[PDB]
């Protein structure tokens, strides 16, 4: 579970226009986790660009730990 | 109560420029007080710091208009 956090946070910030994970919230449920993580993004992204890096975190992470089941991404404004 | 004051939320936060309707809406009582959590629809072109702009105005405007309601969380999301 720390675990998996960490190789979540890991495999999210190696997507590109990731600026760091503010928040993860993550449960198991049995051998399955749900989990809900809000990415920085740079705040001049269009909101357009800003959905296609929480598709590509969403991907990247389910592709990297495969016992999640769910996971919702979405992003805020965060600076460098 | 409950569902007079969703209405009114809806209607508030529509009348904000800048917001393409309410995609999620979800109020909880937590004490006489309502706490309440939103998704707005904004232009997808919009940049990310835009539409964190529009939410903040969404929140003072149904915040203003609605003293019932405690606390108000609002996000947004691209659509057409």
Same mark, same amino acid.
């Given at each position: 579970? $720390?675990?998996?956090?960490?190789?979540?946070?890991?495999?999210?910030?190696?997507?590109?226009?990731?600026?760091?994970?503010?928040?993860?919230?993550?449960?198991?449920?049995?051998?399955?986790?749900?989990?809900?993580?809000?990415?920085?993004?740079?705040? $001049?992204?269009?909101?357009?660009?800003?959905?296609?890096?929480? $598709?590509?975190?969403?991907?990247?992470?389910?592709?990297?730990?495969?016992?999640?089941?769910?996971?919702?991404?979405?992003? $805020?404004?965060?600076?460098?």
């Amino acid at each position: 579970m $720390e675990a998996v956090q960490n190789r979540i946070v890991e495999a999210a910030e190696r997507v590109p226009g990731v600026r760091g994970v503010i928040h993860l919230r993550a449960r198991y449920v049995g051998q399955d986790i749900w989990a809900d993580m809000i990415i920085g993004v740079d705040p $001049e992204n269009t909101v357009e660009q800003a959905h296609e890096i929480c $598709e590509a975190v969403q991907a990247a992470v389910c592709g990297k730990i495969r016992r999640i089941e769910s996971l919702h991404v979405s992003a $805020e404004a965060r600076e460098i």
